[model samples]
Target: SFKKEHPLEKRQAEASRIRNKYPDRIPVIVERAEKSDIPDIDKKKYLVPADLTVGQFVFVIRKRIKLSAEKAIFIFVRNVLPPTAAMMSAIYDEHKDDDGFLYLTYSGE
Candidate 1:
């Protein structure tokens, strides 16, 4: 049984986790692929944690675009590609462009 405090706990937990472990930030560009409903605003520069996982990246983007968290989105390096949770460290190292921007594109799934 879920209490009224349940949602509050979830929010505070996320905040505390972010404040405690991840303070290093990295810059990246979030782009919306064809047929995506994500608005123009969400497709912009993000100063995100360098060590954030792919799943966490998805979570943040979903919030930025105000999408339903339950809905799945296809996120990739550039175009048609998918990366696992542990993939960003490698991708970040190998794929960043000259502006030090990591191009991550997403489409509604």
Candidate 2:
């Protein structure tokens, strides 16, 4: 559904434009993990501070979904779990997709 509005080429161009406009931010696409019970997030696209850690972003996602304190949330980049302590820029540098977006999935334990 996310790609329904923008074609792959368009999305890639947009990503490049955004990158040039704001070099300090990383383009990210966050989605609900496949077949997971996690609630859908309203906003999918994000331009987050490059210095933010994965753990900090996870907390932000939990708040967005209003998850209870006792619940657990897991975030994956490129279908692989990224270290929470890793900086977003670090992940973006290594795992960014060809579309120029960092795709991430959030799931519940």
Candidate 3:
């Protein structure tokens, strides 16, 4: 017999418990990506989080690190592009200096 709660229902219950513990703050769904919906690269076998574009603005939350902005962008682009052609063409168009956080903007149209 299938008596266990659905997976989503279990997750929801856990979320509610966390919310009660931290009543002042609420959880936010920053990004949601479906693997099936992402476009496949013709020759590449892997897909990266940055390879797919977000229709709306999204924020990147990261831990403290000591990498330069150029290095950070390079790290991201390297994962998205195939190894043979991976290179940093430009630095971040915009950047924030707080806590070594950087963002690379790509126009996916």
Candidate 4:
């Protein structure tokens, strides 16, 4: 099924299983996966709410970047693999370096 047609209830429930709630904003770091992308910038830490769902985080990035409707943003947690789960804790534990911040790679799909 298409992304728009997919059952949000199922997705949301799956996300909930990954994480119950993020009560506070956690430090998250996003870097460019492909260096070829133009306008390289320094990596900055974002204080994102722990409770923000993975899908919600995507929305945040899309809104923050002002992406076009046709554009796609692929987020890879800790710069390893595509996220199969949404919980910050889960993702962080799976791929984070020694650094305290949650590591991630953001790219155009």
Candidate 5:
């Protein structure tokens, strides 16, 4: 005989099974040449961690904005990284602060 279970319950069971099956592993580190190691070039234009912000949105692999927006705010409760689901959504609006930095917000269903 077959038995039925709640969708949420099934999802939870599946998640727990996967988590128990695969234990987390330590990340590997690789070394790379510093900017000074490269030949002459402007380093000011290079993007760095300091250039990132909460509202700023970037496509998964694309380099340019797929939609129009000035400011965006992405919130994370934990240390987890940003979600990749936003790539399929359309741009909604932009936001800015006194610092003149730009951000991109998206529209929700």
Candidate 6:
């Protein structure tokens, strides 16, 4: 379903299935920030390693989207910009949505 006006129940079921299959990876939903001019990321669904830091995640997105080195991409977790050094596992534990997915929104500034 990603962000396409889908039902919450289906989202939860999909997330649960993914989690059951890949227990070590975190189910993530990445969306472009509303009203931002930045190009959309390659995909909305991500299966990120639990030990990855936010900065590393940002680096991957930058490459996927071909974002210029000079421009900055900010990532928000639960509407709060978390520290770059924060681990994915920790962020998932604290800010995971009810559907069991870690929702991330990215914007360029």
Per-candidate TM equals 0.65, 0.95, 0.27, 0.61, 0.24, 0.92
Give the winner by TM-score.
2
- Global lDDT of each candidate: 0.63, 0.91, 0.26, 0.57, 0.25, 0.89
Tens-digit lDDT track of model 1 for 1-104: 11133364564454445435644655566777766776534346576766777777887777777887677866777574656564465566777654454668
Instruction: Quote the lDDT for 57 in model 2.
Output: 96
Please give, for residues 1-109, the per-residue lDDT of candidate 4 as tens digits: 1123436565445334434344355556665666535223353456676556566676766676677757767777645555534766566556644434466767775
Tens-place lDDT digits, model 3, residues 13-48: 654664466443323222112232222222211112
Lowest summed lDDT across 10 adjacent residues in model 6 is found at 1-10
Give the distance in Å from residue 103's predicted Cα in candidate 1 to where it truly belongs: 0.9
RMSD of each: 12.5, 1.0, 15.8, 13.4, 19.1, 1.4
Tens-digit lDDT track of model 6 for 29-91: 998888888989878888999999999999988988998999999999867899999989999
Report how far off residue 3 is in candidate 2 (Å).
3.4
How accurate locally is residue 49 in candidate 6, as Cα lDDT from 0 to 100? 94
Residue-level lDDT tens digits of model 2 in 1-109: 5666679988899999999999999999999988999789989998999999999999889888998969899999878899999999999999998989898998998
lDDT order of candidates, top first: 2, 6, 1, 4, 3, 5
Q: Clashes in candidate 4: how many? A: 2
lDDT of 5 at 95: 24
- In candidate 4, which residue ranges exceed 4 Å CA deviation? 1-23, 36-43
72 Cα displacement, candidate 6 (Å): 0.9
lDDT of 4: 0.57
lDDT of 1: 0.63
Question: How many pairs in model 5 have backbone atoms within 3 A of each other, for residues 3 or more apart or on separate chains, i.e. clashes?
Answer: 10
Candidate 3 Cα errors over 4 Å, as ranges: 1-6, 28-60, 64-68, 71-109
Query: In angstroms, how far off is 107's CA in candidate 6?
Result: 0.7
